Amino acid sequence: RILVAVLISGTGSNLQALIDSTREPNSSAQIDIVISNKAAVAGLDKAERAGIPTRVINHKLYKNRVEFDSAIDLVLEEFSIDIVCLAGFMRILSGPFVQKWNGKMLNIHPSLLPSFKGSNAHEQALETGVTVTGCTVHFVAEDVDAGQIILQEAVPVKRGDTVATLSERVKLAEHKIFPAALQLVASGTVQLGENGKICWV
């Protein structure tokens, strides 16, 4: 069974969906550690109540990106981790850290990439006026524009929607495709070919 780590910054609703799925009898993965860059958030309570240990690593206490990322990597090695999942982690990782984990780190984004990159995707979609939006799960690459896509799900926009109502609807889709993608990669069904392109068995 593959050992996994989940990194967060807030509430932890996606984290909970991942915990519940890896608990199922037929799962190929197991979550052994949860890390947050912010103290006292709700996501930490969720991890402790499921019997998973936690660690808080504050970016404000370091001199730069590389030193912060190195502190995180030390912990991943301590727990012999194989795969990393970014679930609401609001930081940009340095080049070398991304190189070391190439093909072994997944991220969730609230839009149908390549549309609406960056922060506040829902607000962007409403300003633009699309009638269809969605969510994406992808591998992380040295440039936030070429990460290979694994799975996507389209979500409709209703006239009259507010940022709060659209966010709620897209979140329900996120809880579906993130757990499904972790299982595809953990079982070897989906891999990143050495030609830099996605590959299915």
Curated annotation (Swiss-Prot):
Positions bearing the site annotation: Raises pKa of active site His: D145
Name the record gives this protein: Trifunctional purine biosynthetic protein adenosine-3
Spans annotated as GART domain: 4-201
Function: Trifunctional enzyme that catalyzes three distinct reactions as part of the 'de novo' inosine monophosphate biosynthetic pathway.
Quaternary structure note: Homodimer.
Chain residues that bind N(1)-(5-phospho-beta-D-ribosyl)glycinamide: G12, S13, N14, K171, L172, A173, E174
Catalytic residues (positions): H109 (proton donor)
